[PDB]
A paper describes a structure:
Further 3D classification allowed the 2PF fibrils to be separated into two sub-types. A minority of the wider fibrils (13% of all data) are in a different conformation, in which the two protofilaments are arranged ‘tail-to-tail’. However, this polymorph has C2 symmetry, and the two subunits in each molecular layer are thus identical. Notably in this structure the N- and C-termini of each subunit adopt a ‘downwards’ conformation. This blocks the inter-protofilament surface observed in ΔN6-2PFa.
Author numbering:
A (entry chain D), B (entry chain B), C (entry chain F), D (entry chain A), E (entry chain C), F (entry chain E): 6 to 92
The structure:
Amino acid sequence: MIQVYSRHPAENGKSNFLNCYVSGFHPSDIEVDLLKNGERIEKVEHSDLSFSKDWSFYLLYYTEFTPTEKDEYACRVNHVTLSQPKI
Amino acid sequence: MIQVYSRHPAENGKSNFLNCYVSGFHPSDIEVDLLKNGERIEKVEHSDLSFSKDWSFYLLYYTEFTPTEKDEYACRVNHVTLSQPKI
Amino acid sequence: MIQVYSRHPAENGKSNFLNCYVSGFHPSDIEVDLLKNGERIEKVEHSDLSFSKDWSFYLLYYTEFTPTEKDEYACRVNHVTLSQPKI
Amino acid sequence: MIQVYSRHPAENGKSNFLNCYVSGFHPSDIEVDLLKNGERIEKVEHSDLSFSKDWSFYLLYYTEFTPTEKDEYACRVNHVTLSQPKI
Amino acid sequence: MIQVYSRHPAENGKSNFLNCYVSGFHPSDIEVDLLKNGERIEKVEHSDLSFSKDWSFYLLYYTEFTPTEKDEYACRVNHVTLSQPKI
Amino acid sequence: MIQVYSRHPAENGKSNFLNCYVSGFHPSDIEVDLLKNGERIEKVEHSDLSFSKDWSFYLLYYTEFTPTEKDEYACRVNHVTLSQPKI
């Protein structure tokens, strides 16, 4: 007998907002599961749940890397109000 | 006997809004599952749930990488109000 | 007999907001699990849950790395108010 | 995996022979069985294998029991030979 | 894994022979069994294997028991030979 | 893993032979068993294997027991030979 009681009442402005510049590897809210709720299981073999192997931002082989850039970031944010009254 | 009680009452402005620039690898809200609720299972073999293997933002072989760019980011946000009254 | 009582009532502005510049490897809110709730399980073998192997920001082989850049970061944030009254 | 190896090579003159007088309750070679060889059985309920309840040779109610008998037992057995050579 | 190796090579003149007089309750070679060989059985309830309840040779109620008998037992046995050579 | 090796090579003239008079309660060679060989059994309840309850040779209620008997036992046994050579 397994009983699970999961509650997530409220979320306000969870993630990734009001950003001038976002880049790169940013996966979010990803759920990978096997036999999350299991009862009376004889066997389970050869399970592979590897998310990734190698993280390399710059991987160059016999390369000539010459980027020229002049980037100006001038984002403006005014009067942002977040309210979560709870009674 | 397995009993699950999952509640998600409210979400307001979850993700990825009011952004000047978004790029790259950003998958979201992805669910991959096998036998999430299982009862009286004899066996389960050779399960592969690998999400990915290799993350490489720049992967170059015998390359001449010469990008010239002049990018100006001038986004403006005014009077953003988020309200979640709860009584 | 397994009983689980998990509660997450409230979240306000969780992560990654009001940022001038975000880059790199930043995955978030990722859950990988195997047999999270298990009862009367005879055996489980050969489980692999490796998230990653190698983290290398700069990985170069026989490379000439000559980037020229003049980047100016001038983001402005005014009058940000976060309120979470609880009664 | 259940393996049963039952051998009964030889029987010679098993029972109830060369008898002058046999009477009464003598049942023989009676086998009563339920699920003699069973594998992976979830449940089994309300099994009744009672052979008998009450043994009463003389059961009399308000009876007048007056038997007169003159019985002579004069059986003769000569030169009975039992041979079971085993090589 | 259950392995049973039962051997009964030889029996010679097992029981109840060359008897002048046999009477009463004498059942023989009676086997009553439930789930003799069982593997991976969750439950088994309410099993009744009672052979008998009450043994009463003389059970009389308000009875007049007056038997007259003159019994002579004159059985003769000569030259009984039992041989079981084993080599 | 349960392994049973039972051997009963030889029996010669087991029981109840060459008897002048046999009476009463004499059951023989009776086997009553439940789950003789059992492996990985969760539960077993309410088992009743009572062979008998009460043994009363003379049970009389308000009885007049007046048996008259003149019994003569004159059985004769001559030259009984039992041989079990083992080499």
